[PDB]
Design a protein around this motif. Structure first.
Motif, short mmCIF file in Angstrom:
data_model
loop_
_atom_site.label_atom_id
_atom_site.label_comp_id
_atom_site.label_asym_id
_atom_site.label_seq_id
_atom_site.Cartn_x
_atom_site.Cartn_y
_atom_site.Cartn_z
N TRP A 189 0.83 -1.19 0.00
CA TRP A 189 0.00 0.00 0.00
C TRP A 189 0.87 1.25 0.00
CZ3 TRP A 189 -0.54 3.23 4.52
CH2 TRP A 189 -1.41 4.31 4.32
N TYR A 234 -2.24 10.57 5.04
CA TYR A 234 -1.67 9.54 5.92
C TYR A 234 -0.75 8.59 5.15
CZ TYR A 234 -4.15 10.66 10.26
OH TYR A 234 -4.60 11.25 11.41
N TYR A 235 0.38 9.15 4.71
CA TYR A 235 1.31 8.45 3.83
C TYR A 235 2.03 7.31 4.56
CZ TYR A 235 0.53 11.98 0.25
OH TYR A 235 -0.03 12.79 -0.70
N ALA A 236 2.85 6.59 3.81
CA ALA A 236 3.61 5.47 4.37
C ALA A 236 5.01 5.90 4.77
CB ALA A 236 3.67 4.32 3.37
N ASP A 254 -7.27 -1.10 9.47
CA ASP A 254 -7.67 -0.63 10.79
C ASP A 254 -6.58 0.26 11.38
OD1 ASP A 254 -5.72 -2.53 11.46
OD2 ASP A 254 -6.68 -2.92 13.39
N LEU A 280 -3.15 3.37 10.01
CA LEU A 280 -2.57 4.26 9.01
C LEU A 280 -1.97 3.46 7.86
CD1 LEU A 280 -0.92 7.43 10.53
CD2 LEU A 280 -1.35 7.12 8.09
N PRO A 281 -1.04 2.57 8.16
CA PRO A 281 -0.40 1.76 7.11
C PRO A 281 -1.07 0.40 6.92
CG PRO A 281 0.89 1.66 9.11
CD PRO A 281 -0.20 2.65 9.37
N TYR A 282 -1.75 0.21 5.79
CA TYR A 282 -2.41 -1.07 5.53
C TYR A 282 -1.42 -2.12 5.05
CZ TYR A 282 -6.84 1.41 5.98
OH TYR A 282 -7.90 2.15 6.45
N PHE A 308 -13.68 1.73 18.52
CA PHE A 308 -12.49 1.62 19.35
C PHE A 308 -12.89 1.62 20.81
CE2 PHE A 308 -10.01 3.65 15.80
CZ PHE A 308 -9.49 2.46 15.41
N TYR A 351 -7.67 8.97 17.93
CA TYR A 351 -8.80 8.84 17.03
C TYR A 351 -10.11 9.10 17.75
CZ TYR A 351 -5.29 6.27 14.49
OH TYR A 351 -4.14 5.88 13.87
#
Ligand SMILES: *[C@@H]1O[C@H](CO)[C@@H](O[C@@H]2O[C@H](CO)[C@@H](O)[C@H](O)[C@H]2NC(C)=O)[C@H](O)[C@H]1NC(C)=O
Lengths: 229, 214, 247, 33
Positions: free
Chosen positions: A47, A59-61, B92, B94-96, C110, C143
């Motif tokens: 991703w 929301y970058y990697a 679920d 930020l990074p999938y 959550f 969040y």
């Protein structure tokens, strides 16, 4: 209906910049989310980036940040990924897919994520031009011969522009003809070899001419393979 | 926030069986994920949303089991057009993150390779480089070894291999290894040999030639 | 209806409950009974019935059951492991889903720890995933804890809204409470019958009489304490009881 | 080992009932794996 088209990728040197295009069709584009996902060839998926329904939520990697940016056109149902400061390492195939289930992103959860109607790759080498292909015939020999059959082929090496094809006898022989995956050398150029087996009673008897065609360039050469002198 | 998944990668079975792939998830329990299949030369495809509950079109031979930190894809009743990769994406955060893939392969009777060595063509030695090709034709177990030897010295780090997709007719593989030398270094040795090891061979087969002998 | 993260809670009480009008209404897409099979509901009595109400997706109705997991059963609404009642659910796409998306139906996604059974949590504190404290502002690993179904009328089944009602019969330690609607039928005198007046059970022939009870008196008995009269609870007339001939 | 049937008979002793007509009215079946 729901289907996506992509364009904008090719061959460029490292350090440069390029923007992509991910267009939509069918559904309402400005309600969904849009993902960016890649895989280096021979590796797994990864991703890359995401944005909401044009709500400025990236929301970058890792590492990606500071080199990539996301821009979608809700009015024209298109999406662009522009990358700068290339690394000569992020050469891959790239896919864009839709989401409707993220949390701080798109309003309301709708449908399944990742419906995957994309394609499109990008090469980042130094070959630049289309380094013509150099061809040799690999002769049928007793070291390749065993009993009833013997193998002969054509070695087509040192070319950058990846799509290259070698046929046998203008497309005649389909038995035993097997072109092996091209290999990428340290020099940066590709190389491959296609071989076919044929009865050992028929070493030189019939025609076995490999037709080499290089489509990015305009190279077309026919090479005959005969037993060793 | 960094998570990763695992997989019992690169499995192989036959027609009409049951397979299992277990994506164990990282810390920070999650909530269901997905299951993608990827026929190579194409784009991926969704098969099962989080936990379970497949989509439409799917021939309904597929099942998941989502219970916290360890999910198991389970396919029953294998079919001869369902061999591909299978990468599962977990969401679920930020990074999938993703899985690693699972290559699939049918089952065929042990077949030894036909081996063949090709010396460099006279045209190439003009150019100033020598490719020495060694071919391994048709063969089930792909776990074959190609050892080049030059004057009986095992050669390391100047070869490249590639392998074909499992053949749709006889379910075999074919492999091509290329040894690359300079003209100068080529002309410094005599015997070029290619020694192939494989399960269908009781002891390894060497095909070899002698540089400069018609 | 009511959200899924703040379900409602109605405490049905002393009444005449007819679970048959429910059971046979054929309008319900899901009617599961756990402690007790459905047809025997109109023949039992408990102390309290509770009814909980909410709205969820279509394919989340399988987490409303004893012993499940998932974002709904973990922290929105948890059913104990020895449940007794029944769970009813029906599709409501035309009422709750509106073009452009109905963003008024939220759920919690959550929480620190899974709910205790029948526990409820309407707080709205900023969740803290990572170790960094949040200080009431959003950000990475900080969040907002509530999400909203955006329901839309052109959603495939399993994404359309379903309304759910969970009936939970409980039996504390009181003296009694709600029960089914005891049956009844016409009467017939001047014949040996098997009668039953309110629980007075016997057999014999019933005639009309010349007695006069007191307004609070419900049946008569003679010396040796055998029932020889009765009042029927709808006409307010007293009837003589005579054993059916024998010899 | 498909045991666990459900019926109307209530099975007065030493008799056994074998048949399949559904208790579906979402759906039910007088057998369980
Ligand atoms: C029980 O309900 C019935 C009606 O459902 C009542 O029957 C009526 O009784 C009066 C006598 O007081 C008659 O004049 C009417 O013609 C009756 N109507 C019907 C429809 O039967 C009966 O009185 C009720 N009894 C009690 C104790 O509530």
């Amino acid at each position: 209906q729901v289907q996506l088209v992509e364009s904008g990728g090719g061959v460029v040197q490292p350090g440069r910049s390029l923007r992509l295009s991910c267009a939509a069709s069918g559904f309402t584009f400005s309600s969904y989310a849009m993902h960016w996902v890649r895989q280096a060839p021979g590796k797994g998926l990864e991703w890359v980036a995401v944005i909401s329904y044009d709500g400025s939520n990236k929301y970058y990697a890792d590492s990606v940040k500071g080199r990539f940016t996301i821009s979608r056109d809700n009015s024209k149902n298109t999406l662009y990924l522009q990358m700068n400061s290339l690394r000569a390492e992020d050469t891959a195939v790239y896919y864009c897919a839709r989401d409707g289930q993220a949390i701080t992103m798109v309003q309301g959860v709708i449908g399944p994520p990742f419906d995957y109607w994309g394609q499109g790759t990008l090469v980042t080498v130094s070959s630049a031009s289309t380094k013509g292909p150099s061809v040799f015939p690999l002769a049928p020999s007793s070291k390749s011969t065993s009993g009833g059959t013997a193998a002969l082929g054509c070695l087509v090496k040192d070319y950058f522009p990846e799509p290259v094809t070698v046929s046998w006898n203008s497309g005649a022989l389909t038995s035993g003809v097997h072109t092996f995956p091209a290999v990428l050398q340290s020099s940066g150029l590709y190389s491959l070899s296609s071989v076919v087996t044929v009865p050992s009673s028929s070493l030189g008897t019939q025609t076995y001419i490999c037709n080499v065609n290089h489509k990015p360039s305009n190279t077309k050469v026919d090479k005959k393979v005969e037993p060793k002198s | 926030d960094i998570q990763m998944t695992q997989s019992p990668s690169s499995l192989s079975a036959s027609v009409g069986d049951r397979v299992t792939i277990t994506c164990q998830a990282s810390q920070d329990i999650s909530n269901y994920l997905n299951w993608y299949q990827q026929k190579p030369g194409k784009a991926p495809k969704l098969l099962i949303y989080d936990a379970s509950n497949l989509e439409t079109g799917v021939p309904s031979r597929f099942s998941g089991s989502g219970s916290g930190t360890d999910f198991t894809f389970t396919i029953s009743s294998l079919q001869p057009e369902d061999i591909a990769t299978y990468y599962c994406q977990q969401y679920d955060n930020l990074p999938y993150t993703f899985g690693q893939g699972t290559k699939l392969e049918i089952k065929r009777t042990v077949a030894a390779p036909s081996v063949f060595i090709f010396p460099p063509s006279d045209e190439q030695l003009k150019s100033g480089t020598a490719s020495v090709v060694c071919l391994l034709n048709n063969f089930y177990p792909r776990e074959a070894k190609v050892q080049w030897k030059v004057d009986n010295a095992l050669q390391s780090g100047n070869s490249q291999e590639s392998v074909t997709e499992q053949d749709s007719k006889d379910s075999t593989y074919s492999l091509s290894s290329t040894l690359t030398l300079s003209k100068a270094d080529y002309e410094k040795h005599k015997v070029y040999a290619c020694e192939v090891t494989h399960q269908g061979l009781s002891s390894p087969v060497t095909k070899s030639f002698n540089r400069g002998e018609c | 209806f009511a959200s899924v993260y703040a379900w409602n809670r109605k405490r049905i009480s002393n009444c005449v409950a007819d679970y048959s009008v429910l059971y046979n209404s054929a309008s319900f897409s899901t009617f599961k009974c756990y402690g007790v099979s459905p047809t025997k509901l109109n023949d039992l009595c408990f102390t309290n019935v509770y009814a909980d109400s909410f709205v969820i997706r279509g394919d989340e109705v399988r987490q409303i059951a004893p012993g499940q997991t998932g974002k709904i059963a973990d922290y929105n609404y948890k059913l104990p492991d020895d449940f007794t009642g029944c769970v009813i659910a029906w599709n409501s796409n035309n009422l709750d889903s509106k073009v452009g998306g109905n963003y008024n139906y939220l759920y919690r996604l959550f929480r620190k720890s899974n709910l205790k059974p029948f526990e409820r949590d309407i707080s709205t504190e900023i969740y803290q995933a990572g170790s960094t404290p949040c200080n009431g502002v959003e950000g990475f690993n900080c969040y907002f804890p509530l999400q909203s179904y955006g329901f839309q009328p052109t959603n495939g089944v399993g994404y359309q809204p379903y309304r759910v009602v969970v009936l939970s019969f409980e039996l504390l330690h009181a003296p009694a409470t709600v029960c089914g609607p005891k049956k009844s039928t016409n009467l017939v005198k001047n014949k040996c019958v098997n009668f039953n007046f309110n629980g007075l059970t016997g057999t014999g022939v019933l005639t009309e009489s010349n007695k006069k009870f007191l307004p609070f008196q419900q049946f008569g008995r003679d010396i040796a304490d055998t029932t020889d009269a009765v009042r029927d609870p709808q006409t307010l007339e007293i009837l003589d009881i005579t054993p059916c001939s024998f010899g």
